[PDB]
Amino acid sequence: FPLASPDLNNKIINLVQQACNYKQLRKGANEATKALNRGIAEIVLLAADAEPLEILLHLPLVCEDKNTPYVFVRSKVALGRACGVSRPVIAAAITSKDGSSLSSQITELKDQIEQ
Template sequence: MNQIYDMLQANSNGRIKKGSNEVTKTAERGTAQFIILAEDVNPPELLAHIPLICAEKGIPFGYVADQEHLAQAAGLPAGVKAASIAVMEITKGAQEDFNNVVKAIEGLKA
């Protein structure tokens, strides 16, 4: 979903947490604003628990196709991969993109 990449790039000054352990912690604490998971994670069980926690805590989440593109959109160095990203705060410049992504994801669930 390109909207997720766009939102993450627009939120470049916002705080993020990266990696399955950090993302799991933020989800359990309910402190994440949005969680992004890469679909190409191997084994998929690495992230399988995160959507369940998000549903329990009411945290919106979405999937993107590729770990490398996710890392790039998050502003991580070239060649780095990110299986998951937790967006901790939404900057003013990214608020509209964030709202659009959440609406699109809620529309898919309906």
């Protein structure tokens, strides 16, 4: 709600690993909120099993006000591993970058969120 499939979960995980190679990924709730406040967040990803739950209730509202798409993946552990870190991650943001070659895969995940 809006939760991934787990087709997408695996497709999101794939995009997340690319994002990391392109330096277009911000890992962690506060880093995600900073991307949203700078207007560079393209998609915000949230782990359905994150604690505290106030983050999970809270970040969607902030995304909505800022007109940024967001989607729930199943676990912080697979988000954390896709992020190239050995700890779980509760939220992440795929950021926009002027001239990026990822722009096409990003704008395509973005609209499959609509759906």
